Design a protein around this nucleic acid. Sequence first.
DNA 1: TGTATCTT
DNA 2: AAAGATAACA
Length: 223
Amino acid sequence: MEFFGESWKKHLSGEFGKPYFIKLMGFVAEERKHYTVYPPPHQVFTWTQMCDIKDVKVVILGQDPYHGPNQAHGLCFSVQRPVPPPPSLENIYKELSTDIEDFVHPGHGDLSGWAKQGVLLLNAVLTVRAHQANSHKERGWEQFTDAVVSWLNQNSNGLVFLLWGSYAQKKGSAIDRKRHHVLQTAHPSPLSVYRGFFGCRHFSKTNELLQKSGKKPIDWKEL
DNA sequence: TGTATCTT
DNA sequence: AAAGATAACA
């Protein structure tokens, strides 16, 4: 048992020997020698440990991990107990409450329950230097997450991609818009939420698009 | 003081 | 690129 889930390691292993990835991991290792980097090494790839790669039905793509202590744990927008939901997640919960009739604030911020149902909780960038948002951008993470999105695009049909924010939206060109459903809106952060996130109804729309393709809907309340 | 996005 | 301007407030 390791950092990468078996099925993800098997299909993404071709990236490991590529120069950008070797250099990216070197950069991250060097950053950890001088600064506090989030999430810890063992949690950078938690998004690969929740379900099999072939069981992915929905992909939520954020910007980068939470940059505060004890927050990021490798699943986008998620925080393990007893850490309270950060601002971006409180906004996700508010949208879910107005979008899904049965949804109420669960009392925690752990999104493992969604990930276990086949919801890939990914960020465009997978590490961040403490207290500095998007500090690890354009270092190689985007090419790796492009590989993840491209694999899902080429080897699956009818997935739902929820691209939240400008950085996540750059992955729109790696997806065949006629074969998969791409939903784009502003990032849920308080700084951008009013630019489209509130009222986007992405959660009900995702379930309707899944049910149309004959696939089982996501139980957003299963947390 | 802190949690994006567009403009210069 | 990086910094300034900007909308939203617990």
